[PDB]
Scaffold this motif. Structure first.
Motif, PDB file in Angstrom:
ATOM      1  N   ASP A  19       0.838  -1.191   0.000  1.00  0.00           N
ATOM      2  CA  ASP A  19       0.000   0.000   0.000  1.00  0.00           C
ATOM      3  C   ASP A  19       0.875   1.244   0.000  1.00  0.00           C
ATOM      4  OD1 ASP A  19      -2.084   1.784   0.089  1.00  0.00           O
ATOM      5  OD2 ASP A  19      -2.513   1.481   2.217  1.00  0.00           O
ATOM      6  N   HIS A  22       0.041   4.327   2.212  1.00  0.00           N
ATOM      7  CA  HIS A  22       0.054   4.223   3.665  1.00  0.00           C
ATOM      8  C   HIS A  22       0.569   5.527   4.270  1.00  0.00           C
ATOM      9  CE1 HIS A  22       1.303   3.083   7.718  1.00  0.00           C
ATOM     10  NE2 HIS A  22       0.525   2.020   7.615  1.00  0.00           N
ATOM     11  N   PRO A  23      -0.123   6.038   5.302  1.00  0.00           N
ATOM     12  CA  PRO A  23       0.165   7.329   5.943  1.00  0.00           C
ATOM     13  C   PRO A  23       1.631   7.535   6.337  1.00  0.00           C
ATOM     14  CG  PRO A  23      -1.198   5.884   7.334  1.00  0.00           C
ATOM     15  CD  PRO A  23      -1.260   5.360   5.943  1.00  0.00           C
ATOM     16  N   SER A  90       0.116  -3.468  13.191  1.00  0.00           N
ATOM     17  CA  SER A  90       0.287  -2.292  12.339  1.00  0.00           C
ATOM     18  C   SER A  90       1.740  -2.074  11.916  1.00  0.00           C
ATOM     19  CB  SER A  90      -0.242  -1.046  13.051  1.00  0.00           C
ATOM     20  OG  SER A  90      -1.539  -1.279  13.570  1.00  0.00           O
ATOM     21  N   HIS A 132       8.168   5.174  19.476  1.00  0.00           N
ATOM     22  CA  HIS A 132       7.601   5.126  20.826  1.00  0.00           C
ATOM     23  C   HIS A 132       6.587   3.994  21.040  1.00  0.00           C
ATOM     24  CE1 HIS A 132       3.773   7.746  20.028  1.00  0.00           C
ATOM     25  NE2 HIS A 132       4.108   7.051  18.957  1.00  0.00           N
ATOM     26  N   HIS A 133       6.122   3.374  19.960  1.00  0.00           N
ATOM     27  CA  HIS A 133       5.236   2.217  20.083  1.00  0.00           C
ATOM     28  C   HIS A 133       6.028   0.922  20.215  1.00  0.00           C
ATOM     29  CE1 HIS A 133       1.549   4.294  19.828  1.00  0.00           C
ATOM     30  NE2 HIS A 133       1.540   4.517  18.526  1.00  0.00           N
ATOM     31  N   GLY A 141       2.813  -0.299  15.790  1.00  0.00           N
ATOM     32  CA  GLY A 141       2.438   1.056  15.419  1.00  0.00           C
ATOM     33  C   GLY A 141       3.447   1.811  14.576  1.00  0.00           C
ATOM     34  N   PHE A 142       3.859   1.195  13.471  1.00  0.00           N
ATOM     35  CA  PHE A 142       4.817   1.768  12.516  1.00  0.00           C
ATOM     36  C   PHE A 142       6.222   1.881  13.112  1.00  0.00           C
ATOM     37  CE2 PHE A 142       0.891   4.551  11.434  1.00  0.00           C
ATOM     38  CZ  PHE A 142       0.209   3.440  10.980  1.00  0.00           C
ATOM     39  N   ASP A 171       3.072  13.220  20.923  1.00  0.00           N
ATOM     40  CA  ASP A 171       2.398  12.488  19.860  1.00  0.00           C
ATOM     41  C   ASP A 171       0.982  12.179  20.342  1.00  0.00           C
ATOM     42  OD1 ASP A 171       1.568   9.665  18.646  1.00  0.00           O
ATOM     43  OD2 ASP A 171       2.989  10.566  17.236  1.00  0.00           O
ATOM     44  N   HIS A 173      -0.817   9.716  20.069  1.00  0.00           N
ATOM     45  CA  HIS A 173      -0.945   8.352  20.566  1.00  0.00           C
ATOM     46  C   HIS A 173      -0.066   8.137  21.798  1.00  0.00           C
ATOM     47  CE1 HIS A 173      -1.899   8.237  16.217  1.00  0.00           C
ATOM     48  NE2 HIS A 173      -2.822   7.361  16.571  1.00  0.00           N
ATOM     49  N   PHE A 202      -6.030   4.051  19.560  1.00  0.00           N
ATOM     50  CA  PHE A 202      -4.736   3.372  19.483  1.00  0.00           C
ATOM     51  C   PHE A 202      -3.743   3.928  20.507  1.00  0.00           C
ATOM     52  CE2 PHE A 202      -2.308   0.321  17.152  1.00  0.00           C
ATOM     53  CZ  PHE A 202      -0.991   0.721  17.269  1.00  0.00           C
ATOM     54  N   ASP A 264       0.675  14.382  15.027  1.00  0.00           N
ATOM     55  CA  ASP A 264      -0.635  13.898  14.616  1.00  0.00           C
ATOM     56  C   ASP A 264      -1.730  14.464  15.513  1.00  0.00           C
ATOM     57  OD1 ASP A 264       0.684  12.519  16.578  1.00  0.00           O
ATOM     58  OD2 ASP A 264       0.413  10.539  15.670  1.00  0.00           O
ATOM     59  N   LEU A 271      -5.508  11.339  11.194  1.00  0.00           N
ATOM     60  CA  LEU A 271      -5.562  10.259  12.174  1.00  0.00           C
ATOM     61  C   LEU A 271      -5.881  10.747  13.588  1.00  0.00           C
ATOM     62  CD1 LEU A 271      -4.752   8.437   9.934  1.00  0.00           C
ATOM     63  CD2 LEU A 271      -2.755   7.693  11.244  1.00  0.00           C
ATOM     64  N   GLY A 302       5.082  10.458  15.089  1.00  0.00           N
ATOM     65  CA  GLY A 302       3.984  10.409  14.141  1.00  0.00           C
ATOM     66  C   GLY A 302       3.707  11.745  13.476  1.00  0.00           C
ATOM     67  N   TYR A 304       0.885  12.880  10.008  1.00  0.00           N
ATOM     68  CA  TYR A 304       0.570  12.325   8.693  1.00  0.00           C
ATOM     69  C   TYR A 304      -0.072  13.321   7.727  1.00  0.00           C
ATOM     70  CZ  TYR A 304       1.348   8.375  11.716  1.00  0.00           C
ATOM     71  OH  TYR A 304       1.888   7.501  12.630  1.00  0.00           O
TER      72      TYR A 304
HETATM   73  C1  LIG Z   1      -4.126   4.321  10.005  1.00  0.00           C
HETATM   74  C2  LIG Z   1      -3.799   3.284   8.958  1.00  0.00           C
HETATM   75  N1  LIG Z   1      -3.879   3.468   7.642  1.00  0.00           N
HETATM   76  C3  LIG Z   1      -3.500   2.295   6.971  1.00  0.00           C
HETATM   77  C4  LIG Z   1      -3.419   1.987   5.556  1.00  0.00           C
HETATM   78  C5  LIG Z   1      -3.000   0.705   5.140  1.00  0.00           C
HETATM   79  C6  LIG Z   1      -2.662  -0.270   6.087  1.00  0.00           C
HETATM   80  C7  LIG Z   1      -2.743   0.034   7.476  1.00  0.00           C
HETATM   81  C8  LIG Z   1      -3.163   1.326   7.899  1.00  0.00           C
HETATM   82  C9  LIG Z   1      -3.351   1.952   9.221  1.00  0.00           C
HETATM   83  C10 LIG Z   1      -3.108   1.266  10.613  1.00  0.00           C
HETATM   84  C11 LIG Z   1      -4.410   0.716  11.201  1.00  0.00           C
HETATM   85  N2  LIG Z   1      -4.166  -0.023  12.450  1.00  0.00           N
HETATM   86  C12 LIG Z   1      -4.620   0.804  13.595  1.00  0.00           C
HETATM   87  C13 LIG Z   1      -3.681   1.980  13.795  1.00  0.00           C
HETATM   88  C14 LIG Z   1      -2.307   1.745  14.054  1.00  0.00           C
HETATM   89  C15 LIG Z   1      -1.453   2.803  14.232  1.00  0.00           C
HETATM   90  C16 LIG Z   1      -1.939   4.118  14.151  1.00  0.00           C
HETATM   91  C17 LIG Z   1      -0.967   5.279  14.353  1.00  0.00           C
HETATM   92  C18 LIG Z   1      -0.111   5.252  15.442  1.00  0.00           C
HETATM   93  C19 LIG Z   1       1.140   6.153  15.475  1.00  0.00           C
HETATM   94  O1  LIG Z   1       1.822   6.310  14.441  1.00  0.00           O
HETATM   95  N3  LIG Z   1       1.527   6.808  16.694  1.00  0.00           N
HETATM   96  O2  LIG Z   1       2.610   7.584  16.721  1.00  0.00           O
HETATM   97  C20 LIG Z   1      -3.299   4.357  13.890  1.00  0.00           C
HETATM   98  C21 LIG Z   1      -4.163   3.291  13.711  1.00  0.00           C
END
Ligand SMILES: Cc1[nH]c2ccccc2c1CCNCc1ccc(/C=C/C(=O)NO)cc1
Ligand SMILES: [K+]
Ligand SMILES: [K+]
Ligand SMILES: [Zn+2]
Length: 357
Positions: A19, A22-23, A90, A132-133, A141-142, A171, A173, A202, A264, A271, A302, A304
């Motif tokens: 993808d 993706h953000p 994630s 941080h995740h 979380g990325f 952040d 989150h 999240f 974010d 988000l 984060g 986005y």
């Molecule tokens: C928000 C988002 N857009 C997409 C597009 C394609 C695949 C996965 C994704 C996701 C992740 C969805 N899983 C839940 C989730 C997981 C992580 C986050 C962001 C957390 C973050 O980056 N904190 O600093 C927000 C939501």
């Protein structure tokens, strides 16, 4: 008086093969860097080089098993990259992910090193992927490795064991990884402001609630400021800093301030859903600059909206450069639930911090 800035476009190589929309985009750090240049900020900064973190350095916070697994993804086929990514919450992985994660961590190490040895006073780190995740034993979380938590441990390694480091996480989150890593530690104070919504946000764990103040000798050194009831902004975050963050920070008296700076919670982020302005982040930055003799390191997490995060982080760098804070408005009134949230945190950390009462 000098301000450091580290950026390396090599950290853009980390990308989502399945993808591309993706953000957590590669252009997140490039757009921010471009903005610094447009706003005459980059020129006023000392360019700190990026470098790879060592596996020895990763071991300061991460298990050898977790390190080896992420490390092995460097040589994986797309198929195995996909399956490994689905073993975490994630997480997407490409062949350059591990390297970029090492560069992000290594960049902040040199930035921290530059500060503590007086080479610079403060510094900004335009890095990716975030951290941080990231837990001790897993990615989330990325995030692959906890850059901020590793930077704290690294800073202590090149100074002393009990070097008081304050990590501020603004952040939107909750930094679940950073909390768990220092949960029993009183040398590293962790303060996080995060959207919570009673766990409906999240990373969806009650570990982010105000009642989680730490464990053992770390009791009181974990400060969760959880927001409930929708969109928050400058009034709420300034009130949080005024009555919680800064009073606790002064009593702790840190010798190094690390900022988990996700953007974010910014106005325009798809988000977060908050509305903290660039002027807001500037004042948050400025307040933190009064701590630890100005020894502040701002680490990207984060964020986005490419325009929002470029404008916001640039403002922070402007403050670090000693520029005058912009005018801040409409700080009254707060959402009622924000006052309630602050009151719950105050009640929870009142036994540990006299500066609160
Ligand atoms: C928000 C988002 N857009 C997409 C597009 C394609 C695949 C996965 C994704 C996701 C992740 C969805 N899983 C839940 C989730 C997981 C992580 C986050 C962001 C957390 C973050 O980056 N904190 O600093 C927000 C939501
Ligand atoms: K946070
Ligand atoms: K702690
Ligand atoms: Zn975030």
């Amino acid at each position: 008086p000098i301000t450091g800035l580290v950026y390396d476009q090599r950290m853009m190589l980390h990308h989502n093969m399945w993808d591309s929309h993706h953000p957590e985009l590669p252009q997140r750090i490039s757009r921010i860097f471009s903005r610094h240049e447009e706003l005459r900020l980059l020129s006023r900064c000392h360019r700190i080089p990026a470098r790879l973190a060592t596996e020895e350095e990763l071991a300061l916070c991460h298990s050898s098993k977790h390190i080896s697994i992420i490390k092995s993804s460097e040589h994986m086929k797309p198929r195995d990259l996909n399956r490994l990514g689905d073993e975490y919450n994630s997480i997407f992985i490409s062949n350059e992910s591990y390297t970029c994660a090492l560069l992000a961590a290594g960049s902040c190490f040199n930035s921290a090193q530059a500060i503590l040895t007086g080479q610079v006073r403060n510094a900004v780190a335009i890095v990716r992927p975030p951290g941080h995740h990231a837990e001790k034993d897993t990615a989330c979380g990325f995030c692959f490795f906890n850059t901020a938590a590793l930077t704290a441990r690294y800073a202590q390694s090149i100074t002393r064991e009990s070097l008081r480091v304050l990590i501020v996480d603004w952040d939107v989150h909750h930094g679940n990884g950073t909390q768990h890593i220092f949960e029993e530690d009183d040398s590293v104070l962790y303060i996080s402001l995060h959207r919570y919504e009673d766990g409906a946000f999240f990373p969806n764990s009650e570990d982010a609630n105000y009642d989680k103040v730490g464990l053992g000798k770390g009791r009181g050194y974990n400060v969760n400021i959880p927001w409930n009831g929708g969109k928050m902004g400058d009034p709420e975050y300034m009130a949080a800093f005024h009555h919680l963050v800064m009073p606790i920070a002064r009593e702790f008296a840190p010798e190094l301030v690390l900022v988990s700076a996700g953007f974010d919670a910014a106005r325009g982020d798809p988000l977060g859903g908050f509305q903290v302005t660039p002027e807001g982040y500037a004042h948050l930055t400025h307040q933190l600059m009064s701590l630890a003799a100005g020894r502040v390191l701002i680490i990207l997490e984060g964020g986005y909206n490419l325009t929002s995060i470029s404008e916001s982080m640039s403002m922070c760098t402007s403050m670090l450069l000693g520029d005058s804070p912009p005018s801040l408005d409409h700080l009254t009134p707060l959402k009622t639930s924000a006052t309630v949230s602050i009151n719950n945190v105050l009640r929870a950390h009142a036994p540990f911090w006299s500066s609160l009462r």
